[PDB]
Design an enzyme around this catalytic site. Structure first.
Site, PDB file in Angstrom:
ATOM      1  N   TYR A 149       0.809  -1.210   0.000  1.00  0.00           N
ATOM      2  CA  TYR A 149       0.000   0.000   0.000  1.00  0.00           C
ATOM      3  C   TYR A 149       0.833   1.247   0.000  1.00  0.00           C
ATOM      4  O   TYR A 149       1.970   1.259   0.437  1.00  0.00           O
ATOM      5  CB  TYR A 149      -0.960   0.012   1.194  1.00  0.00           C
ATOM      6  CG  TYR A 149      -0.276   0.275   2.516  1.00  0.00           C
ATOM      7  CD1 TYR A 149      -0.108   1.567   2.991  1.00  0.00           C
ATOM      8  CD2 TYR A 149       0.187  -0.782   3.312  1.00  0.00           C
ATOM      9  CE1 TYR A 149       0.516   1.811   4.210  1.00  0.00           C
ATOM     10  CE2 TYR A 149       0.823  -0.540   4.510  1.00  0.00           C
ATOM     11  CZ  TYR A 149       0.995   0.735   4.962  1.00  0.00           C
ATOM     12  OH  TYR A 149       1.614   0.942   6.189  1.00  0.00           O
TER      13      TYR A 149
ATOM     14  N   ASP B 255       2.681   7.220   4.288  1.00  0.00           N
ATOM     15  CA  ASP B 255       3.030   5.844   4.719  1.00  0.00           C
ATOM     16  C   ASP B 255       3.043   4.972   3.489  1.00  0.00           C
ATOM     17  O   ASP B 255       2.123   5.020   2.670  1.00  0.00           O
ATOM     18  CB  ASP B 255       2.018   5.329   5.754  1.00  0.00           C
ATOM     19  CG  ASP B 255       2.458   4.043   6.462  1.00  0.00           C
ATOM     20  OD1 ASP B 255       3.639   3.653   6.371  1.00  0.00           O
ATOM     21  OD2 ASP B 255       1.579   3.422   7.091  1.00  0.00           O
TER      22      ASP B 255
ATOM     23  N   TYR C 175      -9.310   8.311  10.359  1.00  0.00           N
ATOM     24  CA  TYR C 175      -8.990   8.728  11.727  1.00  0.00           C
ATOM     25  C   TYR C 175      -9.867   9.827  12.238  1.00  0.00           C
ATOM     26  O   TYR C 175      -9.623  10.395  13.348  1.00  0.00           O
ATOM     27  CB  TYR C 175      -7.497   9.071  11.859  1.00  0.00           C
ATOM     28  CG  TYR C 175      -6.621   7.884  11.567  1.00  0.00           C
ATOM     29  CD1 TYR C 175      -6.422   6.905  12.539  1.00  0.00           C
ATOM     30  CD2 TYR C 175      -5.978   7.744  10.339  1.00  0.00           C
ATOM     31  CE1 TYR C 175      -5.600   5.814  12.291  1.00  0.00           C
ATOM     32  CE2 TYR C 175      -5.188   6.634  10.062  1.00  0.00           C
ATOM     33  CZ  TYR C 175      -4.995   5.681  11.056  1.00  0.00           C
ATOM     34  OH  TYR C 175      -4.207   4.559  10.807  1.00  0.00           O
TER      35      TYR C 175
END
Lengths: 121, 124
Positions: free
Chosen positions: A38, A50, A95
């Site tokens: 990913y 990330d 989030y």
């Protein structure tokens, strides 16, 4: 174009980049360990926060058990082996209003390119 | 309820480990930087006691590479101090957790986190 709305609020939208094998036998199931690569970015800036590709280490998790953000459990459950997608997650599926750490502000839309490499039980 | 020694792992009081169950002795029994470690954990907020994440609830041990910054800083520091089969409770100031931002619905900004961590095994 195929932009799959996986939730009816438009909060999880999976654009298929490469179709997978496509079979019924070919999608992971709840509790399976999945292996993915990913790359995650913020929609607002477009900057990657990330990447398992950068680490050169595939990411493993157990599907449908809340080990990952909601939008991941929803997206990966819809994928077949070897599928590559780009998924857009509203903050409710990531989030939320709180954000997460230094890299993810509150109320951030996240975009992940996810490639489903393999899964097992 | 036993009187247990607390081990400060930083000079600022931000990572304090209480050993609940001593692990195996020796250096062969301590994980090294880069090793894959396998742990079980339960994470709660100190302020409310709410459990925000538990591998024990999932019944799935969690695996990561030690000392790479792939977990919160207090976990890299705590697990580096453990030995095989150790179970500890570690108190993390937010500097060693999710900082001013927090992390999702269950971890507010500037939260102290308490993790029960059990080091199950590790390998190269």
């Amino acid at each position: 174009l195929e932009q799959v709305h996986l939730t009816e609020d438009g909060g999880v939208v999976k654009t298929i980049l490469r179709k997978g094998e496509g079979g019924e036998e070919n999608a992971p199931k709840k509790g399976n360990e999945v292996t993915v690569h990913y790359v995650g970015k913020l929609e607002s800036s477009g900057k990657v926060f990330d990447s398992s590709r950068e680490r050169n280490v595939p990411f493993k998790f157990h599907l449908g058990q809340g080990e990952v953000i909601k939008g991941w459990d929803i997206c990966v459950a819809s994928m077949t082996k070897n599928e590559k997608c780009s998924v857009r997650l509203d903050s409710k599926y990531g989030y939320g209003e709180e954000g997460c750490g230094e890299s993810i502000p509150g109320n951030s839309v996240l975009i992940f390119e996810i490639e489903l490499i393999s899964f097992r039980e």
